[PDB]
């Protein structure tokens, strides 16, 4: 296992990608899947060590360009929408 990085993975035949972290919520001794409103799996029970892990997609981001017009000067500035510098 490896955590704290956006990785590609498959669990018992289901494929996915994102970052996996330890979970605090208590899982019933028979359930295996955690689902949200949009019907996307987020909680996985490991089949070897019997732990609960939570999957979160890594950073989305957004890029915008501020320009004063190429007719005058050829310089630009960059704006990131949700990136936390």
């Amino acid at each position: 296992l490896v955590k704290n990085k956006c990785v590609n993975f498959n669990f018992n035949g289901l494929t996915g990608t994102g970052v996996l972290t330890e979970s605090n919520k208590k899982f019933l001794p028979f359930q295996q899947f955690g689902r949200d409103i949009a019907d996307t799996t987020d909680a996985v029970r490991d089949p070897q060590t019997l732990e609960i892990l939570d999957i979160t997609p890594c950073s989305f981001g957004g890029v915008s360009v501020i320009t004063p017009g190429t007719n005058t000067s050829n310089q630009v500035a960059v704006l990131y929408q949700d990136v936390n510098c």
Partner: protein, 48 residues
């Protein structure tokens, strides 16, 4: 929603079918989701 496909998750269907056979099922999902988005866009256009 299902929209008439075997499964509602793109990765699951993409991981269980031959791509020539899979090309006939993704189209239904694409059409359904596009038609879903258009209505919301139109409603927002009217409300503004």
């Amino acid at each position: 929603s299902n929209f008439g496909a075997i499964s509602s998750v793109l990765n699951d269907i993409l991981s269980r079918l031959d791509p020539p056979e899979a090309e006939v099922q993704i189209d239904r999902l694409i059409t359904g989701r596009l038609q879903s988005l258009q209505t919301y866009v139109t409603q927002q256009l009217i409300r503004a």
